[PDB]
Amino acid sequence: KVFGRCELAAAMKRHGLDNYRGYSLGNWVCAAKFESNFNTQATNRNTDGSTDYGILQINSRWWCNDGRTPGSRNLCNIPCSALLSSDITASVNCAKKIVSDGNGMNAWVAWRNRCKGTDVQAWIRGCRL
Ligand SMILES: [Cl-]
Ligand SMILES: [Cl-]
Ligand SMILES: [Cl-]
């Protein structure tokens, strides 16, 4: 599924992400835009052999099991393929654990490089939330 901007903002808000650990909804929408272009099916391979999965490009090195990332952890206790669903629930619950980990949303490289310190409220402008 490729979410529309406001559609995803609403789904994210419903799943408790608005101001979760202090990060306004715009931050989350911005992150998803640059991580996956709002596509729940996005996968991308990393140089170390891990893979990033779904709307928030959650990494098999730490957070999910894909059975092909030697030495990795599965801290969200889910198969990586569950992060590719049209329903964002699994990605959101895992994202809550990631963002609580210590470095906040800096865990998402695209958030740090493209969203952090920007006018993130523009991502939710005009949306019915
Ligand atoms: Cl915002
Ligand atoms: Cl593995
Ligand atoms: Cl959803």
From Swiss-Prot:
The keyword Disulfide bond applies. It is found in: Secreted. The gene is LYZ. This is Lysozyme C. The lineage of its organism: Eukaryota, Metazoa, Chordata, Craniata, Vertebrata. Disulfide bonds join C6-C127, C30-C115, C64-C80, C76-C94. GO terms for cellular component: cytoplasm; endoplasmic reticulum; extracellular space. It is an enzyme of class 3 (hydrolase). PANTHER family: LYSOZYME C (PTHR11407:SF28).
